[PDB]
Amino acid sequence: MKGNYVQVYVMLPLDAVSVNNRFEKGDELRAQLRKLVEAGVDGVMVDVWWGLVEGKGPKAYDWSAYKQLFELVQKAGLKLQAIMSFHQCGGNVGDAVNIPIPQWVRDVGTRDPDIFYTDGHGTRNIEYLTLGVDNQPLFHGRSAVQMYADYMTSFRENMKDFLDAGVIVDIEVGLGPAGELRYPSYPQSHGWSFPGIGEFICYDKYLQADFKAAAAAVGHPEWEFPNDAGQYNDTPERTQFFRDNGTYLSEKGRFFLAWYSNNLIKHGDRILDEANKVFLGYKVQLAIKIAGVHWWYKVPSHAAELTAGYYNLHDRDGYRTIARMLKRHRASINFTCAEMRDSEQPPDAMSAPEELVQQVLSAGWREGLNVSCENALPRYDPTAYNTILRNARPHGINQSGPPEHKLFGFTYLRLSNQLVEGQNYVNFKTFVDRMHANLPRDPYVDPMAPLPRSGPEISIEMILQAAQPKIQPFPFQEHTDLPVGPTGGMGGQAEGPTCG
Ligand SMILES: OC[C@H]1O[C@H](O[C@H]2[C@H](O)[C@@H](O)[C@H](O)O[C@@H]2CO)[C@H](O)[C@@H](O)[C@@H]1O
Ligand SMILES: OC[C@H]1O[C@@H](O)[C@H](O)[C@@H](O)[C@@H]1O
Numbered sequence: 001m002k003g004n005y006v007q008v009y010v011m012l013p014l015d016a017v018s019v020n021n022r023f024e025k026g027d028e029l030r031a032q033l034r035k036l037v038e039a040g041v042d043g044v045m046v047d048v049w050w051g052l053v054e055g056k057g058p059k060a061y062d063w064s065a066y067k068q069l070f071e072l073v074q075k076a077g078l079k080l081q082a083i084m085s086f087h088q089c090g091g092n093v094g095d096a097v098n099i100p101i102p103q104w105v106r107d108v109g110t111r112d113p114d115i116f117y118t119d120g121h122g123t124r125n126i127e128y129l130t131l132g133v134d135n136q137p138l139f140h141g142r143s144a145v146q147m148y149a150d151y152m153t154s155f156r157e158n159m160k161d162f163l164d165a166g167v168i169v170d171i172e173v174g175l176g177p178a179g180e181l182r183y184p185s186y187p188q189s190h191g192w193s194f195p196g197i198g199e200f201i202c203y204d205k206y207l208q209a210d211f212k213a214a215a216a217a218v219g220h221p222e223w224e225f226p227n228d229a230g231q232y233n234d235t236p237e238r239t240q241f242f243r244d245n246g247t248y249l250s251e252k253g254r255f256f257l258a259w260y261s262n263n264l265i266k267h268g269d270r271i272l273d274e275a276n277k278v279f280l281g282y283k284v285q286l287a288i289k290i291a292g293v294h295w296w297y298k299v300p301s302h303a304a305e306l307t308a309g310y311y312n313l314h315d316r317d318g319y320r321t322i323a324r325m326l327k328r329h330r331a332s333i334n335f336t337c338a339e340m341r342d343s344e345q346p347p348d349a350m351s352a353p354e355e356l357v358q359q360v361l362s363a364g365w366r367e368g369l370n371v372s373c374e375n376a377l378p379r380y381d382p383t384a385y386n387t388i389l390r391n392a393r394p395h396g397i398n399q400s401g402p403p404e405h406k407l408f409g410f411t412y413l414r415l416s417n418q419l420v421e422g423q424n425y426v427n428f429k430t431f432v433d434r435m436h437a438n439l440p441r442d443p444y445v446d447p448m449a450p451l452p453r454s455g456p457e458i459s460i461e462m463i464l465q466a467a468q469p470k471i472q473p474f475p476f477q478e479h480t481d482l483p484v485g486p487t488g489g490m491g492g493q494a495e496g497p498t499c500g
Pocket of ligand 1: 011047083085089093177178337374375376377
């Protein structure tokens with residue numbers, strides 16, 4: 001039944017190593033990572049916050065709390081997915097700990113405000129560096145991807161012992177807010193609230209100039225940004241841009257959207273080129289996280305997706321363009337909406353979770369990429385685990401083989417006292433059982449090969465030919481064929497350690 005084994009990973013507290021590079025909660029974590037392996041979890045995932053390590057200065061890396069944390073993990077026998085977290089913790093949902101980007105970068109920003117994504121009003125979003133300064137050498141003679149690449153080269157030099165023994169199996173290079181390839185279009189920070197459409201975050205002078213230069217390239221210098229796209233909390237109908245047969249379909253608006261959405265491809269391309277020549281040769285896999293912007297999916301404009309950077313429509317696959325860019329790099333997609341079901345989203349959201357999971361996992365599987373998921377919200381119900389299991393093996397168990405399509409692995413959000421305690425614990429455990437096709441945990445499964453080098457760079461126009469025509473999804477079963485059962489599952493009822 002091994003072909004059907006899907007690895008489960010838990011995501012560690014946002015603060016596995018505390019708010020100032022001091023690994024503190026080690027004994028708690030030691031007890032918390034004890035039950036997780038009794039549950040049979042394959043490995044864990046932590047952020048390697050850029051603001052904690054090079055916080056103190058240019059190239060002043062302090063891997064100390066982090067060498068100790070991974071020490072704990074290795075000792076627990078767990079695989080580790082590390083997230084190269086070049087973004088601020090605090091601002092999004094579920095962000096309790098608050099870790100900003102490096103103070104010395106934020107100080108550069110004081111001098112040049114345009115280094116942070118800027119909305120139409122001119123509000124500076126401090127949580128991630130605009131993709132416009134990727135190749136702008138203004139961080140004291142270092143450009144942002146130089147900075148991103150030196151941060152990852154240093155991670156390799158210092159974490160080598162873990163990279164050799166095979167504890168670190170996946171590097172997830174973050175490329176935007178929450179470490180996701182996208183724009184900060186729905187910033188709870190700036191008074192956006194779900195299911196609002198969000199805004200186009202492309203007003204800083206670097207992108208503000210990439211576009212005017214791009215406008216004149218196609219003969220239209222005169223062209224500006226969408227005047228009619230509304231505000232954060234509007235609904236499509238309310239704006240002239242996202243309204244049925246609105247400017248999102250006009251030449252000016254198709255071009256804009258092509259630009260805006262291409263910038264994210266390119267950003268992610270550049271930085272992945274580098275993460276690939278850094279980890280080049282390692283038994284690791286490179287991944288990126290793509291948001292799950294399900295609200296306004298059921299409407300024609302797909303507004304929230306268009307503002308977030310994913311130019312997805314009924315006739316244009318905006319998630320297969322992205323996966324085509326990941327293809328050279330032998331990268332994989334890490335999508336985040338797996339636990340939802342259309343049933344549970346507010347009816348006015350015009351949200352289609354299930355249909356977004358099917359689109360992205362299908363674009364990815366079509367591009368030959370390994371796809372993996374992560375739930376977007378705190379969920380401890382069997383419903384959540386069965387929806388996940390459905391999405392893991394769309395077509396279900398193929399005991400007569402390995403299945404057509406299968407997720408490489410799932411990474412549950414998040415480790416808490418509540419997950420490893422009682423009821424929630426026996427559900428999670430039986431969930432893991434089932435995610436492994438009820439086989440016992442196997443660590444010598446899905447062994448990676450030394451990361452090859454990124455293949456030949458391919459133009460924008462060559463990655464963009466995957467958009468058209470949008471293909472049909474891969475037939476998804478409606479429920480999983482190996483659900484949670486109910487409360488219990490194989491061993492019974494497990495009872496043990498609290499917290500202190
Ligand atoms: O631990 C990883 C990141 O967790 C949060 O971001 C999550 C977000 O809460 C969730 O809705 C989405 O599905 O995935 C992201 C990215 O994994 C923090 O906000 C991030 O700062 C962390 O990097
Ligand atoms: O902050 C972003 C989050 O907002 C929530 O209200 C939605 O339910 C989530 O799908 C989304 O990820």
